[PDB]
Design a protein around this motif. Sequence first.
Motif, PDB file in Angstrom:
ATOM      1  N   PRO A 201       0.806  -1.225   0.000  1.00 43.82           N
ATOM      2  CA  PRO A 201       0.000   0.000   0.000  1.00 43.82           C
ATOM      3  C   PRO A 201       0.841   1.278   0.000  1.00 43.82           C
ATOM      4  O   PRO A 201       0.415   2.305  -0.526  1.00 43.82           O
ATOM      5  CB  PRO A 201      -0.881  -0.149   1.249  1.00 43.82           C
ATOM      6  CG  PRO A 201      -0.154  -1.155   2.099  1.00 43.82           C
ATOM      7  CD  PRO A 201       0.403  -2.124   1.092  1.00 43.82           C
ATOM      8  N   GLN A 202       2.044   1.211   0.564  1.00 44.38           N
ATOM      9  CA  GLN A 202       2.916   2.383   0.598  1.00 44.38           C
ATOM     10  C   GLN A 202       3.298   2.873  -0.792  1.00 44.38           C
ATOM     11  O   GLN A 202       3.731   4.013  -0.958  1.00 44.38           O
ATOM     12  CB  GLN A 202       4.175   2.088   1.405  1.00 44.38           C
ATOM     13  CG  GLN A 202       3.928   2.077   2.888  1.00 44.38           C
ATOM     14  CD  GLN A 202       5.194   1.859   3.665  1.00 44.38           C
ATOM     15  OE1 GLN A 202       5.671   0.729   3.791  1.00 44.38           O
ATOM     16  NE2 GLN A 202       5.765   2.949   4.180  1.00 44.38           N
ATOM     17  N   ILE A 203       3.158   2.010  -1.792  1.00 48.20           N
ATOM     18  CA  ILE A 203       3.457   2.423  -3.151  1.00 48.20           C
ATOM     19  C   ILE A 203       2.172   2.396  -3.961  1.00 48.20           C
ATOM     20  O   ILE A 203       2.201   2.400  -5.190  1.00 48.20           O
ATOM     21  CB  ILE A 203       4.533   1.542  -3.833  1.00 48.20           C
ATOM     22  CG1 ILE A 203       4.119   0.069  -3.803  1.00 48.20           C
ATOM     23  CG2 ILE A 203       5.882   1.765  -3.161  1.00 48.20           C
ATOM     24  CD1 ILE A 203       5.040  -0.819  -4.611  1.00 48.20           C
TER      25      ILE A 203
ATOM     26  N   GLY B 132      10.117   4.886  12.763  1.00 49.11           N
ATOM     27  CA  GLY B 132      10.022   5.836  11.681  1.00 49.11           C
ATOM     28  C   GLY B 132       9.246   5.101  10.604  1.00 49.11           C
ATOM     29  O   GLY B 132       8.978   3.905  10.740  1.00 49.11           O
ATOM     30  N   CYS B 133       8.876   5.798   9.542  1.00 50.44           N
ATOM     31  CA  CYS B 133       8.144   5.168   8.460  1.00 50.44           C
ATOM     32  C   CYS B 133       8.427   5.899   7.163  1.00 50.44           C
ATOM     33  O   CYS B 133       8.394   7.126   7.110  1.00 50.44           O
ATOM     34  CB  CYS B 133       6.642   5.187   8.742  1.00 50.44           C
ATOM     35  SG  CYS B 133       5.637   4.473   7.404  1.00 50.44           S
ATOM     36  N   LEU B 134       8.705   5.136   6.114  1.00 48.42           N
ATOM     37  CA  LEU B 134       8.992   5.714   4.816  1.00 48.42           C
ATOM     38  C   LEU B 134       7.827   6.562   4.333  1.00 48.42           C
ATOM     39  O   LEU B 134       7.995   7.414   3.463  1.00 48.42           O
ATOM     40  CB  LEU B 134       9.292   4.612   3.803  1.00 48.42           C
ATOM     41  CG  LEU B 134      10.586   3.828   4.044  1.00 48.42           C
ATOM     42  CD1 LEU B 134      10.758   2.761   2.963  1.00 48.42           C
ATOM     43  CD2 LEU B 134      11.761   4.785   4.025  1.00 48.42           C
ATOM     44  N   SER B 135       6.646   6.327   4.893  1.00 47.64           N
ATOM     45  CA  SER B 135       5.473   7.096   4.507  1.00 47.64           C
ATOM     46  C   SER B 135       5.270   8.298   5.428  1.00 47.64           C
ATOM     47  O   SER B 135       4.347   9.084   5.240  1.00 47.64           O
ATOM     48  CB  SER B 135       4.230   6.206   4.515  1.00 47.64           C
ATOM     49  OG  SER B 135       4.273   5.276   3.444  1.00 47.64           O
TER      50      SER B 135
ATOM     51  N   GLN C 165       5.277  -6.169  12.764  1.00 39.96           N
ATOM     52  CA  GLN C 165       4.018  -5.565  13.177  1.00 39.96           C
ATOM     53  C   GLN C 165       3.834  -4.235  12.461  1.00 39.96           C
ATOM     54  O   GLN C 165       2.749  -3.923  11.973  1.00 39.96           O
ATOM     55  CB  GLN C 165       4.000  -5.370  14.694  1.00 39.96           C
ATOM     56  CG  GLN C 165       4.074  -6.681  15.446  1.00 39.96           C
ATOM     57  CD  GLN C 165       4.066  -6.509  16.943  1.00 39.96           C
ATOM     58  OE1 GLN C 165       3.032  -6.231  17.543  1.00 39.96           O
ATOM     59  NE2 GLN C 165       5.227  -6.673  17.559  1.00 39.96           N
ATOM     60  N   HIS C 166       4.908  -3.463  12.381  1.00 48.73           N
ATOM     61  CA  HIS C 166       4.859  -2.170  11.720  1.00 48.73           C
ATOM     62  C   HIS C 166       4.395  -2.356  10.282  1.00 48.73           C
ATOM     63  O   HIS C 166       3.485  -1.670   9.810  1.00 48.73           O
ATOM     64  CB  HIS C 166       6.246  -1.532  11.742  1.00 48.73           C
ATOM     65  CG  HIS C 166       6.307  -0.191  11.079  1.00 48.73           C
ATOM     66  ND1 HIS C 166       6.630   0.978  11.731  1.00 48.73           N
ATOM     67  CD2 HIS C 166       6.119   0.153   9.781  1.00 48.73           C
ATOM     68  CE1 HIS C 166       6.634   1.966  10.829  1.00 48.73           C
ATOM     69  NE2 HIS C 166       6.331   1.511   9.632  1.00 48.73           N
ATOM     70  N   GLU C 167       5.031  -3.296   9.594  1.00 48.92           N
ATOM     71  CA  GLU C 167       4.714  -3.583   8.206  1.00 48.92           C
ATOM     72  C   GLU C 167       3.296  -4.100   8.020  1.00 48.92           C
ATOM     73  O   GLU C 167       2.568  -3.622   7.157  1.00 48.92           O
ATOM     74  CB  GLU C 167       5.717  -4.593   7.645  1.00 48.92           C
ATOM     75  CG  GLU C 167       7.141  -4.075   7.623  1.00 48.92           C
ATOM     76  CD  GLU C 167       7.236  -2.689   7.012  1.00 48.92           C
ATOM     77  OE1 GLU C 167       6.537  -2.433   6.007  1.00 48.92           O
ATOM     78  OE2 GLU C 167       8.019  -1.862   7.527  1.00 48.92           O
ATOM     79  N   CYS C 168       2.899  -5.072   8.832  1.00 48.08           N
ATOM     80  CA  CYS C 168       1.559  -5.628   8.718  1.00 48.08           C
ATOM     81  C   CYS C 168       0.485  -4.583   9.005  1.00 48.08           C
ATOM     82  O   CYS C 168      -0.599  -4.613   8.413  1.00 48.08           O
ATOM     83  CB  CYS C 168       1.409  -6.825   9.651  1.00 48.08           C
ATOM     84  SG  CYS C 168       2.541  -8.157   9.224  1.00 48.08           S
ATOM     85  N   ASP C 169       0.783  -3.659   9.914  1.00 51.10           N
ATOM     86  CA  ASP C 169      -0.157  -2.592  10.235  1.00 51.10           C
ATOM     87  C   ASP C 169      -0.542  -1.878   8.938  1.00 51.10           C
ATOM     88  O   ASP C 169      -1.702  -1.520   8.735  1.00 51.10           O
ATOM     89  CB  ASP C 169       0.478  -1.595  11.206  1.00 51.10           C
ATOM     90  CG  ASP C 169       0.143  -1.900  12.653  1.00 51.10           C
ATOM     91  OD1 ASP C 169       0.735  -1.273  13.554  1.00 51.10           O
ATOM     92  OD2 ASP C 169      -0.726  -2.760  12.891  1.00 51.10           O
ATOM     93  N   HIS C 170       0.442  -1.682   8.067  1.00 54.25           N
ATOM     94  CA  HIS C 170       0.217  -1.032   6.788  1.00 54.25           C
ATOM     95  C   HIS C 170      -0.860  -1.741   5.986  1.00 54.25           C
ATOM     96  O   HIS C 170      -1.646  -1.099   5.283  1.00 54.25           O
ATOM     97  CB  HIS C 170       1.498  -1.016   5.960  1.00 54.25           C
ATOM     98  CG  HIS C 170       2.416   0.118   6.284  1.00 54.25           C
ATOM     99  ND1 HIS C 170       2.078   1.447   6.141  1.00 54.25           N
ATOM    100  CD2 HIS C 170       3.704   0.107   6.708  1.00 54.25           C
ATOM    101  CE1 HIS C 170       3.143   2.178   6.470  1.00 54.25           C
ATOM    102  NE2 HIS C 170       4.153   1.410   6.821  1.00 54.25           N
ATOM    103  N   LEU C 171      -0.887  -3.064   6.086  1.00 53.53           N
ATOM    104  CA  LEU C 171      -1.864  -3.861   5.354  1.00 53.53           C
ATOM    105  C   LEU C 171      -3.270  -3.647   5.895  1.00 53.53           C
ATOM    106  O   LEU C 171      -4.250  -3.937   5.212  1.00 53.53           O
ATOM    107  CB  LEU C 171      -1.497  -5.347   5.428  1.00 53.53           C
ATOM    108  CG  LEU C 171      -0.076  -5.676   4.960  1.00 53.53           C
ATOM    109  CD1 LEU C 171       0.122  -7.183   4.950  1.00 53.53           C
ATOM    110  CD2 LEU C 171       0.159  -5.098   3.575  1.00 53.53           C
TER     111      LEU C 171
HETATM  112 ZN   LIG Z   1       6.044   2.111   7.561  1.00 54.03          ZN
END
Ligand SMILES: [Zn+2]
Lengths: 177, 177
Positions: B52-54, B100-103, B142-148
């Motif tokens: 989703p980030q892209i 931090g987050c790339l988004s 967890q950080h990554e899955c949260d994005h989903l």
């Molecule tokens: Zn992130």
Amino acid sequence: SVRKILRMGDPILRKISEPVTEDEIQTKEFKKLIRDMFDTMRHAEGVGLAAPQIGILKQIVVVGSEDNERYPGTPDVPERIILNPVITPLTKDTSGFWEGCLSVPGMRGYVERPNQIRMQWMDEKGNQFDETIDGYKAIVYQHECDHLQGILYVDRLKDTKLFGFNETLDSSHNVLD
Amino acid sequence: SVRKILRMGDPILRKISEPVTEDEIQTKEFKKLIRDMFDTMRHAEGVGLAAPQIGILKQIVVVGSEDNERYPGTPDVPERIILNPVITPLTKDTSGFWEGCLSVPGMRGYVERPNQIRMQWMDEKGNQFDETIDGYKAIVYQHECDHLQGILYVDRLKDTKLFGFNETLDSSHNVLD
Ligand SMILES: [Zn+2]
Ligand SMILES: [Zn+2]
């Protein structure tokens, strides 16, 4: 002179500001700080600025928009110095507003604050005020005073989903602009 | 190819990502996306990236970091593809971490997530996994899955006071309770 505006993350922005003594509002140091705060606020195109934002933990707030009185859609805020302010909400009713902060550059978030408050304060002349503020000024004043309590608007976001970067928010929610 | 990383404020980042099928992971489209996600993650110096980030609402996550500059004290994470992940905390115990987050470019926030989780997922080979993850990888996953799930770490900040811009956060110290 324009001073550096501290950004979110700087511990100073989260400290409590101390009251201003009437025995210091006539000092040149205070007058200089005031001038510096207005220079900084204007140079940054802000409508308000609290002393902690430039590193001074004193209950000093300067506000003021320029030329908005006859500009449709853009609320004005008469220029003024607000010292030792104390705000008490007079209503549970709120007006939402996409707030921004000079200490949180490039972003904005939806905040709902009481749209009617009671504010007690002293100006640079030592004058004491106790008025009922509402609308836009009410939002600006609360935003500014929050700074004196080490509070930023991100602490009051209605919802973290209603928060983001200006350019991203602009390009994702277009209007007849 | 490096794709544009959507920033906080973009509605896509808050949508739910759909599962990927076993047939799908064999398509050239999927592989092009995977390669693009790694290119993007690496070029951005990230340790993880969710589709989703892209802009792709699919349950696809790529992770991996070698001597990461964005998180200087963390352990390297071998690159792997995580599809249709499902995480269940195994503990109430948490480890705080200035995420931090790339988004959410230029910022960091203190987040406390369970330091022991169960993750079920499928890799690009169709392999199914059901492991107990802990430590740093647990946080990243967890950080990554949260994005989903359309969730950003700002939604999980321990306290908005422990959040700010990296430049200032690197210079100043915020005392954690
Ligand atoms: Zn992130
Ligand atoms: Zn402000």
